[PDB]
Structure formats: C-alpha cells, structure tokens
CSV table of C-alpha atoms in Angstrom, one decimal:
chain,number,residue,atom,x,y,z
A,10,UNK,CA,-19.1,-13.8,-14.3
A,11,UNK,CA,-17.0,-12.1,-11.6
A,12,UNK,CA,-13.3,-12.1,-12.6
A,13,UNK,CA,-11.0,-13.8,-10.0
A,14,UNK,CA,-7.5,-12.3,-9.6
A,15,UNK,CA,-4.8,-14.7,-10.6
A,16,UNK,CA,-1.0,-14.6,-10.9
A,17,UNK,CA,0.8,-12.6,-13.5
A,18,UNK,CA,-1.9,-9.9,-13.2
A,19,UNK,CA,-1.0,-6.2,-12.8
A,20,UNK,CA,-2.8,-4.5,-9.9
A,21,UNK,CA,-2.6,-1.3,-7.9
A,22,UNK,CA,-3.2,-1.5,-4.1
A,23,UNK,CA,-5.4,1.4,-3.0
A,24,UNK,CA,-6.8,2.5,0.3
A,25,UNK,CA,-9.2,5.2,1.6
A,26,UNK,CA,-8.1,8.2,3.6
A,27,UNK,CA,-10.1,10.3,6.1
A,28,UNK,CA,-8.3,13.6,6.2
A,29,UNK,CA,-10.5,16.5,7.5
A,30,UNK,CA,-13.6,14.4,7.3
A,31,UNK,CA,-13.6,13.3,3.6
A,32,UNK,CA,-13.0,10.0,1.8
A,33,UNK,CA,-10.0,10.2,-0.6
A,34,UNK,CA,-8.6,7.1,-2.3
A,35,UNK,CA,-4.8,6.7,-2.3
A,36,UNK,CA,-2.8,4.1,-4.2
A,37,UNK,CA,0.6,2.7,-3.0
A,38,UNK,CA,3.5,4.0,-5.1
A,39,UNK,CA,7.3,3.6,-5.1
A,40,UNK,CA,10.0,4.7,-7.5
A,41,UNK,CA,12.8,2.4,-8.1
A,42,UNK,CA,15.9,4.5,-8.5
A,43,UNK,CA,16.6,6.7,-5.6
A,44,UNK,CA,14.5,6.2,-2.6
A,45,UNK,CA,13.2,2.8,-2.2
A,46,UNK,CA,10.6,4.0,0.4
A,47,UNK,CA,7.0,3.8,-0.8
A,48,UNK,CA,4.5,6.7,-0.8
A,49,UNK,CA,0.9,7.3,-1.5
A,50,UNK,CA,-0.4,8.8,-4.7
A,51,UNK,CA,-3.7,10.6,-5.0
A,52,UNK,CA,-6.2,8.9,-7.4
A,53,UNK,CA,-9.2,10.7,-6.1
A,54,UNK,CA,-8.8,13.9,-8.3
A,55,UNK,CA,-8.0,12.5,-11.7
A,56,UNK,CA,-10.2,15.4,-12.9
A,57,UNK,CA,-7.7,17.8,-11.1
A,58,UNK,CA,-4.2,16.1,-11.2
A,59,UNK,CA,-3.2,13.1,-13.2
A,60,UNK,CA,-2.4,10.0,-11.2
A,61,UNK,CA,1.0,8.3,-12.1
A,62,UNK,CA,0.2,4.7,-12.1
A,63,UNK,CA,3.4,3.7,-13.9
A,64,UNK,CA,5.0,3.7,-10.3
A,65,UNK,CA,1.8,2.3,-8.7
A,66,UNK,CA,1.3,-0.9,-10.8
A,67,UNK,CA,2.4,-4.1,-9.1
A,68,UNK,CA,2.4,-7.7,-10.7
A,69,UNK,CA,1.5,-10.8,-8.9
A,70,UNK,CA,4.5,-12.9,-10.0
A,71,UNK,CA,4.4,-15.8,-7.6
A,72,UNK,CA,1.8,-17.0,-5.0
A,73,UNK,CA,2.2,-20.1,-2.9
A,74,UNK,CA,0.6,-21.7,0.2
A,75,UNK,CA,2.1,-20.9,3.6
A,76,UNK,CA,3.6,-24.3,4.1
A,77,UNK,CA,4.9,-24.4,0.5
A,78,UNK,CA,6.7,-21.2,1.1
A,79,UNK,CA,8.1,-22.4,4.4
A,80,UNK,CA,9.5,-25.5,2.7
A,81,UNK,CA,10.9,-23.4,-0.1
A,82,UNK,CA,12.5,-21.0,2.4
A,83,UNK,CA,14.0,-24.1,4.3
A,84,UNK,CA,15.3,-25.2,0.8
A,110,UNK,CA,-0.3,-19.1,-14.1
A,111,UNK,CA,-2.4,-19.9,-11.1
A,112,UNK,CA,-5.4,-18.4,-9.3
A,113,UNK,CA,-5.2,-16.8,-5.8
A,114,UNK,CA,-6.9,-18.2,-2.6
A,115,UNK,CA,-7.2,-16.4,0.7
A,116,UNK,CA,-4.3,-17.1,3.1
A,117,UNK,CA,-1.8,-17.7,0.3
A,118,UNK,CA,1.6,-16.2,0.5
A,119,UNK,CA,2.0,-13.8,-2.6
A,120,UNK,CA,5.0,-12.1,-4.1
A,121,UNK,CA,4.6,-8.6,-5.6
A,122,UNK,CA,7.0,-7.1,-8.2
A,123,UNK,CA,7.0,-3.4,-9.0
A,124,UNK,CA,6.5,-3.2,-12.7
A,125,UNK,CA,8.6,-0.1,-13.4
A,126,UNK,CA,11.5,-0.8,-11.1
A,127,UNK,CA,11.5,-4.6,-11.5
A,128,UNK,CA,12.1,-4.9,-7.7
A,129,UNK,CA,9.9,-6.5,-5.2
A,130,UNK,CA,7.8,-5.2,-2.4
A,131,UNK,CA,9.3,-5.9,1.0
A,132,UNK,CA,9.4,-5.0,4.7
A,133,UNK,CA,12.4,-2.8,5.0
A,134,UNK,CA,12.9,-3.5,8.7
A,135,UNK,CA,14.7,-0.1,8.9
A,136,UNK,CA,12.1,2.2,10.3
A,137,UNK,CA,12.1,5.9,9.7
A,138,UNK,CA,10.6,6.3,13.1
A,139,UNK,CA,7.3,7.9,12.2
A,140,UNK,CA,6.6,8.2,15.8
A,141,UNK,CA,5.8,4.5,15.8
A,142,UNK,CA,8.7,2.7,17.4
A,143,UNK,CA,7.2,-0.7,16.8
A,144,UNK,CA,6.4,0.0,13.1
A,145,UNK,CA,8.8,-0.7,10.2
A,146,UNK,CA,9.1,0.8,6.8
A,147,UNK,CA,7.9,-0.8,3.6
A,148,UNK,CA,9.8,-0.3,0.4
A,149,UNK,CA,11.3,-2.2,-2.6
A,150,UNK,CA,13.9,-5.0,-2.4
A,151,UNK,CA,16.0,-6.2,-5.4
A,152,UNK,CA,16.4,-9.8,-4.2
A,153,UNK,CA,13.5,-12.1,-3.8
A,154,UNK,CA,15.3,-14.3,-1.2
A,155,UNK,CA,14.0,-14.3,2.4
A,156,UNK,CA,10.5,-13.9,3.8
A,157,UNK,CA,10.7,-10.1,3.9
A,158,UNK,CA,9.5,-9.8,0.3
A,159,UNK,CA,6.6,-12.3,0.8
A,160,UNK,CA,3.1,-11.3,1.9
A,161,UNK,CA,0.2,-13.3,3.1
A,162,UNK,CA,-3.4,-12.1,2.2
A,163,UNK,CA,-6.3,-12.3,4.7
A,164,UNK,CA,-10.0,-11.6,4.1
A,165,UNK,CA,-11.2,-8.3,5.1
A,166,UNK,CA,-14.4,-9.7,6.7
A,167,UNK,CA,-16.3,-13.0,7.0
A,168,UNK,CA,-17.9,-12.7,3.6
A,169,UNK,CA,-14.5,-13.9,2.4
A,170,UNK,CA,-13.3,-17.1,4.1
A,171,UNK,CA,-10.0,-18.8,4.1
A,172,UNK,CA,-9.3,-20.7,0.9
A,173,UNK,CA,-11.8,-18.9,-1.1
A,174,UNK,CA,-10.6,-17.5,-4.4
A,175,UNK,CA,-10.2,-13.7,-4.4
A,176,UNK,CA,-12.6,-11.7,-6.6
A,177,UNK,CA,-11.3,-8.6,-8.5
A,178,UNK,CA,-13.6,-6.4,-6.4
A,179,UNK,CA,-12.5,-8.0,-3.1
A,180,UNK,CA,-10.7,-6.1,-0.3
A,181,UNK,CA,-7.6,-7.5,1.2
A,182,UNK,CA,-5.7,-7.6,4.4
A,183,UNK,CA,-2.0,-8.0,4.0
A,184,UNK,CA,0.5,-9.2,6.6
A,185,UNK,CA,4.3,-9.1,6.3
A,186,UNK,CA,5.7,-12.7,6.7
A,187,UNK,CA,8.9,-11.2,8.4
A,188,UNK,CA,7.5,-8.9,10.9
A,189,UNK,CA,3.9,-10.0,11.2
A,190,UNK,CA,2.8,-6.4,10.6
A,191,UNK,CA,0.0,-5.2,8.5
A,192,UNK,CA,0.4,-2.9,5.5
A,193,UNK,CA,-0.7,0.1,7.3
A,194,UNK,CA,-1.6,3.8,6.6
A,195,UNK,CA,-0.4,6.1,9.4
A,196,UNK,CA,-2.0,9.5,10.0
A,197,UNK,CA,0.6,10.4,12.6
A,198,UNK,CA,2.5,12.8,10.4
A,199,UNK,CA,0.8,15.6,8.4
A,200,UNK,CA,1.8,13.5,5.4
A,201,UNK,CA,0.3,10.0,5.2
A,202,UNK,CA,2.7,7.2,5.4
A,203,UNK,CA,2.6,3.5,4.4
A,204,UNK,CA,4.3,1.4,7.1
A,205,UNK,CA,4.4,-2.1,8.5
A,206,UNK,CA,2.4,-1.8,11.8
A,207,UNK,CA,0.6,-4.0,14.2
A,208,UNK,CA,-2.5,-1.9,13.4
A,209,UNK,CA,-4.5,-3.4,10.5
A,210,UNK,CA,-5.6,-1.4,7.5
A,211,UNK,CA,-7.8,-2.5,4.7
A,212,UNK,CA,-6.5,-2.5,1.1
A,213,UNK,CA,-8.3,-3.0,-2.1
A,214,UNK,CA,-6.8,-4.2,-5.4
A,215,UNK,CA,-8.0,-3.1,-8.8
A,216,UNK,CA,-7.0,-5.2,-11.9
A,217,UNK,CA,-4.9,-2.8,-14.1
A,218,UNK,CA,-4.2,-5.5,-16.7
A,219,UNK,CA,-4.0,-9.2,-17.4
A,220,UNK,CA,-1.0,-10.1,-19.4
A,221,UNK,CA,-2.3,-13.3,-21.0
A,222,UNK,CA,-5.4,-11.7,-22.5
A,223,UNK,CA,-3.4,-8.8,-24.0
A,224,UNK,CA,-3.6,-8.8,-27.9
A,225,UNK,CA,-0.1,-8.7,-29.3
A,226,UNK,CA,0.7,-5.9,-31.6
A,227,UNK,CA,-2.3,-3.8,-30.4
A,228,UNK,CA,-2.3,-0.6,-28.5
A,229,UNK,CA,-2.6,-1.1,-24.8
A,230,UNK,CA,-3.2,1.3,-21.9
A,231,UNK,CA,-0.1,2.9,-20.3
A,232,UNK,CA,2.0,2.1,-23.3
A,233,UNK,CA,5.0,4.3,-24.1
A,234,UNK,CA,4.9,5.0,-27.8
A,235,UNK,CA,6.1,7.3,-30.6
A,236,UNK,CA,3.5,9.3,-32.7
A,237,UNK,CA,5.1,8.5,-36.0
A,238,UNK,CA,3.7,11.0,-38.7
A,239,UNK,CA,2.1,9.4,-41.8
A,240,UNK,CA,5.1,10.5,-43.9
A,241,UNK,CA,7.3,8.0,-41.9
A,242,UNK,CA,10.1,10.6,-41.8
A,243,UNK,CA,9.1,12.7,-38.7
A,244,UNK,CA,7.8,12.0,-35.2
A,245,UNK,CA,6.0,14.2,-32.7
A,246,UNK,CA,8.5,15.6,-30.3
A,247,UNK,CA,9.3,18.7,-28.0
A,248,UNK,CA,12.4,20.7,-29.1
A,249,UNK,CA,15.8,19.5,-27.9
A,250,UNK,CA,17.3,20.2,-24.5
A,251,UNK,CA,18.7,23.6,-25.0
A,252,UNK,CA,18.1,24.0,-21.2
A,253,UNK,CA,15.2,26.3,-22.1
A,254,UNK,CA,11.9,25.2,-20.4
A,255,UNK,CA,9.9,27.5,-22.5
A,256,UNK,CA,11.7,25.9,-25.6
A,257,UNK,CA,10.8,22.5,-24.3
A,258,UNK,CA,7.2,23.4,-23.7
A,259,UNK,CA,6.4,23.7,-27.4
A,260,UNK,CA,5.4,20.9,-29.8
A,261,UNK,CA,6.6,20.3,-33.4
A,262,UNK,CA,7.2,17.5,-35.9
A,263,UNK,CA,10.9,16.6,-36.3
A,264,UNK,CA,12.7,13.9,-38.3
A,265,UNK,CA,16.1,12.2,-38.1
A,266,UNK,CA,17.7,10.8,-34.9
A,267,UNK,CA,14.8,12.2,-32.7
A,268,UNK,CA,13.0,9.1,-33.9
A,269,UNK,CA,15.4,7.0,-31.9
A,270,UNK,CA,16.1,9.5,-29.2
A,271,UNK,CA,14.1,9.9,-25.9
A,272,UNK,CA,12.4,13.3,-26.5
A,273,UNK,CA,9.9,11.5,-28.9
A,274,UNK,CA,8.4,9.1,-26.2
A,275,UNK,CA,4.9,9.7,-25.2
A,276,UNK,CA,3.1,7.7,-22.5
A,277,UNK,CA,-0.6,7.0,-23.2
A,278,UNK,CA,-2.6,7.3,-19.9
A,279,UNK,CA,-6.3,6.6,-19.8
A,280,UNK,CA,-8.7,8.4,-17.6
A,281,UNK,CA,-9.4,5.2,-15.8
A,282,UNK,CA,-7.7,4.2,-12.6
A,283,UNK,CA,-9.1,0.6,-12.7
A,284,UNK,CA,-8.5,-1.4,-15.9
A,285,UNK,CA,-5.9,1.1,-17.0
A,286,UNK,CA,-4.1,-1.6,-18.9
A,287,UNK,CA,-6.9,-2.3,-21.3
A,288,UNK,CA,-7.1,-2.1,-25.1
A,289,UNK,CA,-7.5,1.5,-26.1
A,290,UNK,CA,-10.9,2.5,-27.9
A,291,UNK,CA,-11.6,4.5,-30.9
A,292,UNK,CA,-13.2,7.6,-29.5
A,293,UNK,CA,-11.7,7.0,-26.0
A,294,UNK,CA,-10.5,10.0,-23.9
A,295,UNK,CA,-6.9,9.7,-22.7
A,296,UNK,CA,-3.9,11.8,-21.7
A,297,UNK,CA,-0.7,12.0,-23.6
A,298,UNK,CA,2.3,12.6,-21.4
A,299,UNK,CA,5.9,13.3,-22.4
A,300,UNK,CA,8.2,10.8,-20.6
A,301,UNK,CA,11.4,12.9,-20.4
A,302,UNK,CA,9.8,16.3,-19.5
A,303,UNK,CA,7.1,14.7,-17.4
A,304,UNK,CA,4.6,17.3,-18.7
A,305,UNK,CA,1.2,16.6,-20.2
A,306,UNK,CA,0.2,17.6,-23.8
A,307,UNK,CA,-2.6,20.2,-23.8
A,308,UNK,CA,-4.4,22.8,-25.8
A,309,UNK,CA,-4.4,26.4,-24.7
A,310,UNK,CA,-7.2,28.9,-25.1
A,311,UNK,CA,-5.2,30.1,-28.1
A,312,UNK,CA,-5.6,26.7,-29.9
A,313,UNK,CA,-1.9,26.2,-29.0
A,314,UNK,CA,-0.3,22.9,-28.5
A,315,UNK,CA,1.6,23.2,-25.2
A,316,UNK,CA,2.8,21.1,-22.3
A,317,UNK,CA,1.7,22.1,-18.8
A,318,UNK,CA,2.6,20.8,-15.4
A,319,UNK,CA,0.8,17.8,-13.7
A,320,UNK,CA,-0.6,20.2,-11.1
A,321,UNK,CA,-2.4,22.3,-13.7
A,322,UNK,CA,-3.1,19.5,-16.2
A,323,UNK,CA,-6.9,18.9,-16.4
A,324,UNK,CA,-9.2,16.6,-18.3
A,325,UNK,CA,-10.8,19.3,-20.4
A,326,UNK,CA,-7.5,20.7,-21.8
A,327,UNK,CA,-5.5,17.4,-21.9
A,328,UNK,CA,-8.1,15.2,-23.4
A,329,UNK,CA,-7.3,13.5,-26.8
A,330,UNK,CA,-8.6,10.5,-28.7
A,331,UNK,CA,-7.9,8.3,-31.7
A,332,UNK,CA,-10.5,8.4,-34.5
A,333,UNK,CA,-10.8,5.7,-37.2
A,334,UNK,CA,-11.8,8.2,-39.9
A,335,UNK,CA,-10.9,11.8,-40.6
A,336,UNK,CA,-14.5,12.6,-41.2
A,337,UNK,CA,-16.5,14.3,-38.4
A,338,UNK,CA,-19.1,11.5,-37.7
A,339,UNK,CA,-19.6,11.3,-33.9
A,340,UNK,CA,-20.1,8.0,-32.2
A,341,UNK,CA,-21.7,9.8,-29.3
A,342,UNK,CA,-20.7,8.1,-26.0
A,343,UNK,CA,-19.6,4.4,-25.8
A,344,UNK,CA,-20.3,2.3,-22.8
A,345,UNK,CA,-17.4,1.6,-20.7
A,346,UNK,CA,-16.4,-2.2,-20.5
A,347,UNK,CA,-14.7,-3.9,-17.5
A,348,UNK,CA,-12.0,-6.2,-18.7
A,349,UNK,CA,-9.0,-6.4,-20.9
A,350,UNK,CA,-11.2,-5.3,-23.9
A,351,UNK,CA,-11.2,-6.0,-27.6
A,352,UNK,CA,-8.3,-5.3,-29.9
A,353,UNK,CA,-9.1,-2.6,-32.4
A,354,UNK,CA,-6.1,-0.1,-32.5
A,355,UNK,CA,-3.1,-2.0,-33.8
A,356,UNK,CA,0.5,-1.0,-33.7
A,357,UNK,CA,2.2,0.0,-36.9
A,358,UNK,CA,-0.9,-0.1,-39.2
A,359,UNK,CA,-3.9,1.6,-37.6
A,360,UNK,CA,-3.9,5.1,-39.1
A,361,UNK,CA,-5.1,7.4,-36.3
A,362,UNK,CA,-6.1,11.1,-36.3
A,363,UNK,CA,-5.7,12.7,-33.0
A,364,UNK,CA,-8.7,14.7,-32.0
A,365,UNK,CA,-9.1,16.9,-29.0
A,366,UNK,CA,-12.2,15.6,-27.0
A,367,UNK,CA,-13.6,18.8,-25.9
A,368,UNK,CA,-12.8,21.3,-28.7
A,369,UNK,CA,-13.4,18.6,-31.3
A,370,UNK,CA,-10.4,20.1,-33.4
A,371,UNK,CA,-8.0,17.7,-35.3
A,372,UNK,CA,-4.3,17.7,-34.8
A,373,UNK,CA,-2.2,18.7,-37.9
A,374,UNK,CA,1.1,20.3,-38.8
A,375,UNK,CA,0.9,24.1,-38.7
A,376,UNK,CA,3.3,24.1,-41.6
A,377,UNK,CA,5.7,27.0,-40.6
A,378,UNK,CA,7.5,25.8,-43.7
A,386,UNK,CA,15.0,18.9,-39.1
A,387,UNK,CA,11.7,20.0,-40.7
A,388,UNK,CA,10.6,21.6,-37.4
A,389,UNK,CA,6.9,21.9,-38.6
A,390,UNK,CA,4.8,23.3,-35.8
A,391,UNK,CA,1.9,21.2,-34.7
A,392,UNK,CA,-1.5,23.1,-34.7
A,393,UNK,CA,-4.9,22.0,-33.7
A,394,UNK,CA,-7.1,22.5,-36.8
A,395,UNK,CA,-10.9,22.6,-37.1
A,396,UNK,CA,-11.1,20.2,-40.2
A,397,UNK,CA,-7.4,19.2,-40.8
A,398,UNK,CA,-5.3,18.6,-43.8
A,399,UNK,CA,-5.2,15.4,-45.8
A,400,UNK,CA,-1.9,14.3,-44.4
A,401,UNK,CA,-3.0,13.9,-40.8
A,402,UNK,CA,-2.5,10.1,-40.5
A,403,UNK,CA,-0.4,9.1,-37.5
A,404,UNK,CA,1.1,5.7,-36.9
A,405,UNK,CA,2.1,4.2,-33.5
A,406,UNK,CA,5.3,2.5,-32.7
A,407,UNK,CA,5.7,0.6,-29.5
A,408,UNK,CA,8.9,1.7,-27.7
A,409,UNK,CA,11.0,-0.9,-26.1
A,410,UNK,CA,10.8,-1.4,-22.3
A,411,UNK,CA,14.5,-0.7,-21.9
A,412,UNK,CA,14.1,2.6,-23.8
A,413,UNK,CA,11.0,3.6,-21.7
A,414,UNK,CA,12.6,2.7,-18.5
A,415,UNK,CA,15.8,4.7,-19.5
A,416,UNK,CA,13.7,7.7,-20.3
A,417,UNK,CA,11.9,7.7,-17.0
A,418,UNK,CA,15.3,7.2,-15.2
A,419,UNK,CA,16.6,10.2,-17.2
A,420,UNK,CA,13.6,12.3,-16.0
A,421,UNK,CA,14.1,11.4,-12.3
A,422,UNK,CA,17.8,12.1,-12.5
A,423,UNK,CA,17.2,15.4,-14.1
A,424,UNK,CA,14.8,16.3,-11.2
A,425,UNK,CA,17.1,15.2,-8.5
A,426,UNK,CA,20.2,16.8,-9.9
A,427,UNK,CA,18.4,20.1,-10.5
A,428,UNK,CA,17.3,20.1,-6.9
A,429,UNK,CA,20.8,19.4,-5.8
A,430,UNK,CA,22.2,22.2,-8.0
A,431,UNK,CA,19.7,24.7,-6.8
A,432,UNK,CA,20.5,23.7,-3.2
A,433,UNK,CA,24.2,24.2,-3.7
A,434,UNK,CA,23.5,27.5,-5.4
A,435,UNK,CA,21.3,28.6,-2.4
B,2413,UNK,CA,14.4,-22.8,13.1
B,2414,UNK,CA,12.8,-19.9,11.2
B,2415,UNK,CA,9.9,-19.5,13.6
B,2416,UNK,CA,12.3,-19.2,16.5
B,2417,UNK,CA,14.4,-16.6,14.6
B,2418,UNK,CA,11.3,-14.6,13.8
B,2419,UNK,CA,9.9,-14.6,17.4
B,2420,UNK,CA,13.4,-13.5,18.7
B,2421,UNK,CA,13.3,-10.7,16.1
B,2422,UNK,CA,9.8,-9.6,17.1
B,2423,UNK,CA,10.8,-9.5,20.8
B,2424,UNK,CA,14.0,-7.6,20.0
B,2425,UNK,CA,12.0,-5.1,18.1
B,2426,UNK,CA,9.4,-4.8,20.9
B,2427,UNK,CA,12.0,-4.0,23.5
B,2428,UNK,CA,15.1,-1.9,22.9
B,2429,UNK,CA,18.4,-2.7,24.5
B,2430,UNK,CA,19.0,0.8,25.8
B,2431,UNK,CA,15.8,0.8,27.8
B,2432,UNK,CA,16.8,-2.4,29.6
B,2433,UNK,CA,20.3,-1.0,30.2
B,2434,UNK,CA,18.8,2.1,31.8
B,2435,UNK,CA,16.4,0.2,34.0
B,2436,UNK,CA,19.4,-1.9,35.2
B,2437,UNK,CA,21.3,1.3,35.7
B,2438,UNK,CA,18.6,2.5,38.0
B,2439,UNK,CA,20.0,2.3,41.6
B,2440,UNK,CA,18.4,1.1,44.8
B,2441,UNK,CA,17.6,3.1,48.0
B,2442,UNK,CA,19.7,1.9,51.0
B,2443,UNK,CA,17.7,1.7,54.2
B,2444,UNK,CA,19.7,3.5,56.9
B,2445,UNK,CA,20.1,3.2,60.7
B,2446,UNK,CA,19.0,6.5,62.3
B,2447,UNK,CA,21.0,8.5,64.9
B,2448,UNK,CA,19.4,6.1,67.4
B,2449,UNK,CA,20.9,3.3,65.3
B,2450,UNK,CA,17.5,1.7,64.6
B,2451,UNK,CA,17.4,0.8,60.9
B,2452,UNK,CA,15.0,3.1,58.9
B,2453,UNK,CA,13.8,0.7,56.3
B,2454,UNK,CA,11.4,2.1,53.7
B,2455,UNK,CA,8.6,-0.3,52.7
B,2456,UNK,CA,10.3,-2.4,50.1
B,2457,UNK,CA,6.9,-3.2,48.4
B,2458,UNK,CA,6.4,0.6,48.1
B,2459,UNK,CA,9.3,1.1,45.7
B,2460,UNK,CA,11.6,-0.2,43.1
C,2316,UNK,CA,2.0,-21.7,23.8
C,2317,UNK,CA,4.7,-19.0,23.6
C,2318,UNK,CA,4.3,-18.5,19.9
C,2319,UNK,CA,0.5,-18.1,20.3
C,2320,UNK,CA,0.9,-15.8,23.3
C,2321,UNK,CA,3.3,-13.5,21.4
C,2322,UNK,CA,1.1,-13.4,18.3
C,2323,UNK,CA,-2.0,-12.5,20.3
C,2324,UNK,CA,-0.1,-9.9,22.2
C,2325,UNK,CA,1.2,-8.2,19.1
C,2326,UNK,CA,-2.2,-8.4,17.3
C,2327,UNK,CA,-3.5,-6.3,20.2
C,2328,UNK,CA,-0.7,-3.9,21.4
C,2329,UNK,CA,-2.8,-2.1,23.9
C,2330,UNK,CA,-1.7,-4.7,26.5
C,2331,UNK,CA,1.9,-3.5,26.5
C,2332,UNK,CA,0.8,-0.3,28.4
C,2333,UNK,CA,1.1,3.3,27.6
C,2334,UNK,CA,4.9,3.3,27.6
C,2335,UNK,CA,5.1,0.6,24.9
C,2336,UNK,CA,1.9,1.1,22.9
C,2337,UNK,CA,4.0,2.4,20.1
C,2338,UNK,CA,2.4,5.9,19.7
C,2339,UNK,CA,3.6,8.6,21.9
C,2340,UNK,CA,5.5,5.9,23.9
C,2341,UNK,CA,8.0,7.5,26.3
C,2342,UNK,CA,9.7,4.0,26.7
C,2343,UNK,CA,10.2,1.5,29.4
C,2344,UNK,CA,13.0,3.5,31.1
C,2345,UNK,CA,11.0,6.7,31.1
C,2346,UNK,CA,8.1,4.8,32.5
C,2347,UNK,CA,10.3,3.4,35.3
C,2348,UNK,CA,11.6,6.9,36.1
C,2349,UNK,CA,8.1,8.3,36.1
C,2350,UNK,CA,6.9,5.4,38.3
C,2351,UNK,CA,9.7,6.1,40.8
C,2352,UNK,CA,8.6,9.8,40.9
C,2353,UNK,CA,5.0,8.7,41.4
C,2354,UNK,CA,5.9,6.2,44.2
C,2355,UNK,CA,7.9,9.0,45.9
C,2356,UNK,CA,5.1,11.4,45.6
C,2357,UNK,CA,2.1,10.6,48.1
C,2358,UNK,CA,-0.6,12.2,46.1
C,2359,UNK,CA,-0.3,9.9,43.1
C,2360,UNK,CA,1.0,6.7,44.8
C,2361,UNK,CA,-1.7,6.8,47.4
C,2362,UNK,CA,-5.5,7.6,47.1
C,2363,UNK,CA,-5.4,10.2,49.9
C-alpha cells in the first residue's frame, strides 16, 4: 500500500542539481534566527558530509482548497493536488513564505523565499501542482510523488537558480520540480520511544553522570574531548546529543537495535567519532565520515551479531524506549564497545573498549524542545559572534 | 478585491517606475527648416 | 480576459522581449536607448 502524504507530516523538499554534468540532490534549508533567507543543503554525499535535516524538515500544518483559502483570507486531513498548503519550519517555528524583497540574483522579476513569523496573508500559502499528467488535479499525493509549487502571492514557482556560482532558491516564473520525502508522521509516533533526530542525553547507568564534552574554557582542543561528568552538566546544554540516522528519507522513524547512526553534539556542532588511536573525539562536519562516526545501540552487551537487518519504509516499530531501554553504544565498523576509561565532577574519560566493563549500561533521556532549541540558538550565536569578533580584530 | 490587488502587484513588479520615468524623459527630435526655409522633417515612423 | 492574459504572459516570460526576460535584462529604458541608437545607425535599422 502506497502511503499518501497528509497534514501534520514532516517532510523535506529536495530537488536535483546538474552542476558540471552530474546529478546532486539538494534539500531546502533555512535557519530561523539570523537570516530568514533559505539555502540549499547537500544530501547527496551523506557518506562524505553529514546533512543537517534539523533545519530542513518542514511540517504540513494546514492545507485547504483554493476557494476555501480565498474565503478565509477574505474573512488531520489528506492532501489533494491543487490544494493550498501551509508549511511550518520545524526548528524555527516560522512559516515558509515569499519574501517579496528580492536579493536581485540577476533575476529582476524573481523574488526571495524565506521564513515568516506570521501566517496571515497569502504570502505564506502555497499551491501544489502535479509534475506531469500521471498525477491529475484532485488526486491524492503519494509519498514518492514529485511536486510543483506556486506562490499564492506572486504566482512564482519555487525555483532553483544556477545564475550565481552558488545555487539559490527563489520565487521565479521559471518552474522547477520538487520532491517531498516523508521524514516522519506525528500520529504514528510511539510515545516514550526513541525517535530519529531526537535530542537526548546519554545518562550513564549509575544515574549520576552523563556523557558530555568539557566545559567552555574557550579551548577548542579542550572541548574536543569526551568524558563522563555529573552534577549540573546533566541540566546544562553541553550534555545534549542529537541522534542523526544515516537516512535522508524517513529520518524521523523509530531507531533500531543495530542501526547505524551519527551522534552530534548540539552546542559544539561537532560529530562524535573514533580516531585511529581508539580515541573518542569530535571532528568537524566536513571531515566527519560514516566509518569513523557510525555508532549503534545493542540490546545485550554480548557480541552476538544480527548481521544486516532489512530497511523498512515507514514510521517503524517501537523497540528502544526512553528511560528504561538499557543500551550499550557499539561502534559499527570497529565493533568495540564504549565504556569509561576510568582515569580515576568525576571526569572519567570515555574509551572505546573491545569487550567493555560490566557498567556499560546507558539510559536515554529526551530533552525538552525548549532546551534543544535554546542549545541550537546558542551554537548559532556563538558562530556569528566569533565571526564578528574575528572581523573586528582583522 | 484580492485578485485585483495581486494583478496590480504583478504588473508593478514586472515594470519598474524608474524605467518609465526615463522613457518619458527621453526627448524628441525637432524637425527644422533649412537655410532655404523648407522644413527638414525626418521620417516620424523612422524614430521615437 | 485581462487576468487570463497576464497569467499566460507570466507563465511564459519570453514574450516580454530580451530587455525584460528577467535574465541579463538591460531594462526597458536601456532597450529604448539602444533602439534610438539602432534607428540612428543605417546598418542596423536598414537591411542594406
């Protein structure tokens, strides 16, 4: 049975790119605080560079017929082609819109596309059109369907411009195809179970320390290391880890035992990894790769290998559960198990051991949305203000 | 009426005001009598 | 009729002409100035 995209689903709008005669998929992204302008993010080299879908996921809050929207402007449903939809950026909480303030990307007619805080007006609203005749008006949209989007305000297509050396999204009279992939479906999510993209704390089985990088002594080399610390770090931001799966589509699905994923520190923005020295270290996004950064949750400490599981398209089954599912982090490639190096604010170093100690149980606590958003805002502010400080010093 | 508002907005985006002001600012050539006094009229359909 | 005509004309922006195609468009005023220059030049204005 082919799934049909309905409201309250989280999707990412991706399109193909043909730079220098190759096909490279790009997803639409926009970061709330700071620039509201959208930009494209590369998801074609997940092997090479992690894609940040946290700023790429949009949710279909409201969809209405064209005449219903016109009447509403004068004053959990499925989607049909030709409907007027409303998209909310998940991280920011703001809606997609036609900015109507063009950056003038050599296209005088084109307008910019960004994020708007208020839903009032037809600028935020978008009407979907079938890519080809195989989809007809009024048909219900499949998950694998392509889409054509037209701004209600400016009657411009969500368009990818090759005019600049850097690709730009813009509202233009030229039409560009877009494909939506179902990241997650909220209704089918199992409460209290670990989900893809969740921001969580790795609470150690002793309940009195959590996995964290050292505090902000302004030393990047200091931050790069990993250790177990207890106390207020459990409620601070330096203990927040984002669980990113290796899948662009259906990223927001229930995590699997023996499923490769990437653990990313929210505040530092660097991905957990294992060096050639069996060293737990955070590397940059550019040099973070699948082989080094792959980690998985295993039901039992014992070394039984389940081989390779078959990937399932859908929300998935609920097996890892928050607060009670005892997990042992195992590096996918090396096969080692994570455990405290015991250099003995305990400050026990985390080492990646071949068989592991008995106290390797790790519990998961789901961080609040407010706290996760605040942590990402902190990271963005840090980056912007460091650039500003370096510019002033220059 | 929203459709009228929208159509006006589209046309305003299509054509900037400054271009129209400049085109209006473009002057006209004046046909001139010659030293003979006969009026030298350039073909009006030839130019602006 | 006006709403339909404008919608078709913006669905296909090639009809506006090179000045207002939107990409590399010099503008209506620049087009008028260049057309004045062309009309003054015999080589471009006439086949010759």
